[PDB]
């Protein structure tokens, strides 16, 4: 139904590759430039590879990478919208990361919060919210991507440095655990793509997170923004803010929260 013929595609350029299979740029019906999330020959079972595409079928928002089409047999493809600027993580680390200041970074955060607020309304969980799974387009447009672990509320593993403790420990994945991940994402944005918890290996991470350790306010980051991070990192998942709140907060940030912001050397 979302199905198309392999005829219609043509995989041109190989952009990355991620161990569950491959990702190419390409065209579709000749007319349209697309991205094609493929699979090298039988990696992970074809139908658990199917269900990222079904998650993407039910979801549609301007701040989510739009599904275009699917090819449900072999070799499988997942045809999606193409984002010219690649992953947010590489963008922050790369050449353009120098020039990004807090107003640009907060606006990127606002967009991501907007996309997740939609996920919130639709009663889904992403379970893998991080800068590496955000895609940038033209005009600094940011969209949430990679719904391989996304599921309706009622495989592989999970990066502990981005995962809420209750989810990493007891498998309790909610929209509130995604809120935790968003808070971690905010540190990625404000540190130009640096790995969270510097010098801390994976379960030094959780054991400290369980003693109540939280990442400190990044250099040149306003404390009001670090306060927002800390709210996203509250031990009780239910004390955590909504993405609806986060979106409005970030959209209005430089008028309501930091009206006297002045540019620094990095932020
Ligand atoms: N819609 C799009 N427009 C433009 N570029 C896109 C794009 N989608 C992906 N890329 C690009 O494909 C690369 C390799 O896949 P990745 O490193 O992302 C990982 F594998 P991915 O998480 O996709 O694989 P998997 O974990 O198996 O789902 C990434 O660097 C990403 O920028
Ligand atoms: Mg990815």
């Amino acid at each position: 139904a979302w199905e198309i013929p392999r005829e219609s595609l043509r995989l041109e350029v190989k952009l990355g590759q991620g161990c569950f299979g491959e990702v190419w740029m390409g065209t579709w019906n000749g007319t349209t430039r697309v991205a094609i999330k493929t699979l090298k020959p039988g990696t992970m079972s074809p139908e658990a590879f199917l269900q990222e595409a079904q998650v993407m079928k039910k979801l549609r928002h301007e701040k989510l990478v739009q599904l275009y089409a699917v090819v449900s047999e072999e070799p499988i493809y997942i045809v999606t919208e193409y984002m010219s600027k690649g992953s947010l993580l590489d963008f922050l680390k790369g050449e353009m990361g120098k020039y990004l200041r807090l107003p640009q970074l907060v606006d990127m955060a606002a967009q991501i919060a907007s996309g997740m607020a939609y996920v919130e309304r639709m009663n889904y969980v992403h379970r893998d919210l991080r800068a590496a799974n955000i895609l940038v387009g033209e005009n600094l447009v940011c969209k949430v991507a990679d719904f391989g672990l996304a599921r309706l509320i009622e495989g592989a593993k999970f990066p502990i440095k981005w995962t809420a403790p209750e989810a990493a420990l007891y498998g309790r994945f909610t929209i509130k655990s995604d809120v935790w991940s968003f808070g971690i994402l905010l540190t990625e944005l404000t540190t130009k793509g640096r790995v969270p918890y510097p010098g801390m290996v994976n379960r030094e991470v959780l054991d400290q997170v369980e003693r109540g350790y939280r990442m400190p306010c990044p250099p040149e980051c306003p404390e009001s923004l670090h306060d927002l991070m800390c709210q996203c990192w509250r031990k009780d998942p239910e004390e955590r803010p909504t993405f609806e709140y986060l979106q409005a907060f970030l959209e209005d940030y430089f008028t309501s929260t930091e009206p006297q912001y002045q540019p620094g050397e990095n932020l």
Side-chain angles (χ1 to χ4, degrees):
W2 276 85
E3 183 67 17
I4 54 162
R6 183 171 294 105
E7 319 315 309
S8 39
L9 298 74
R10 49 177 186 101
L11 305 80
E12 313 185 37
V13 195
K14 178 175 137 122
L15 270 57
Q17 142 251 245
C19 249
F20 279 144
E22 201 168 333
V23 165
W24 296 67
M25 201 207 88
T27 88
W28 175 40
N29 306 334
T31 163
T32 54
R33 183 174 16 264
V34 296
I36 310 148
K37 185 174 304 183
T38 89
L39 197 178
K40 319 165 149 277
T43 306
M44 183 161 191
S45 77
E47 163 163 329
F49 186 71
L50 153 82
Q51 217 45 202
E52 179 184 351
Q54 239 66 31
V55 163
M56 296 183 65
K57 283 174 181 177
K58 310 294 292 184
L59 297 173
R60 181 162 190 177
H61 194 264
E62 59 169 353
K63 297 310 184 179
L64 306 194
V65 174
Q66 189 193 337
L67 177 74
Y68 281 172
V70 71
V71 179
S72 297
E73 332 209 3
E74 338 319 330
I76 313 197
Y77 306 110
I78 300 190
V79 179
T80 74
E81 159 190 21
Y82 167 78
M83 316 299 302
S84 56
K85 303 300 181 181
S87 83
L88 173 59
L89 181 58
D90 302 329
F91 194 85
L92 293 165
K93 293 166 64 68
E95 178 175 290
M96 233 80 93
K98 316 178 41 107
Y99 302 123
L100 296 170
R101 293 295 183 266
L102 199 70
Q104 290 77 44
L105 297 166
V106 163
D107 184 272
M108 294 168 110
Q111 297 175 63
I112 299 172
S114 172
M116 290 304 302
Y118 169 81
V119 172
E120 192 174 69
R121 294 192 299 266
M122 299 282 292
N123 299 125
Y124 277 78
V125 183
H126 189 283
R127 299 206 295 164
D128 203 21
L129 187 60
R130 53 215 294 269
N133 291 336
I134 304 296
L135 282 168
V136 188
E138 218 63 30
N139 197 28
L140 279 179
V141 165
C142 293
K143 306 194 184 203
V144 183
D146 304 18
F147 295 80
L149 293 177
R151 70 171 64 198
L152 177 75
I153 313 152
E154 153 184 59
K157 253 256 178 162
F158 314 87
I160 177 57
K161 292 190 179 192
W162 282 266
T163 314
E166 80 265 359
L169 287 183
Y170 310 134
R172 307 183 163 179
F173 292 86
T174 59
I175 188 66
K176 292 300 191 179
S177 58
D178 276 350
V179 168
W180 178 289
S181 299
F182 183 79
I184 304 292
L185 207 165
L186 286 176
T187 67
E188 286 183 293
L189 281 165
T190 49
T191 59
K192 307 301 176 59
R194 279 292 224 145
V195 172
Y197 309 99
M200 292 180 39
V201 289
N202 276 8
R203 229 130 296 194
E204 181 180 1
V205 171
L206 213 178
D207 208 287
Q208 300 309 308
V209 168
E210 282 294 6
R211 305 186 186 158
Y213 177 85
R214 299 296 184 272
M215 275 182 293
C217 180
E220 298 200 53
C221 180
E223 303 271 355
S224 60
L225 192 52
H226 176 247
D227 287 344
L228 193 77
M229 302 176 183
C230 286
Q231 294 167 216
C232 295
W233 299 337
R234 280 162 177 176
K235 187 229 189 40
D236 186 11
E238 315 290 344
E239 292 186 46
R240 265 109 81 164
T242 62
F243 277 113
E244 172 182 58
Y245 173 82
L246 292 167
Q247 181 190 341
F249 179 89
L250 293 166
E251 280 176 0
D252 289 11
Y253 188 69
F254 292 101
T255 296
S256 302
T257 310
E258 293 300 322
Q260 295 300 321
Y261 163 81
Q262 218 65 253
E265 278 297 294
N266 294 307
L267 294 180

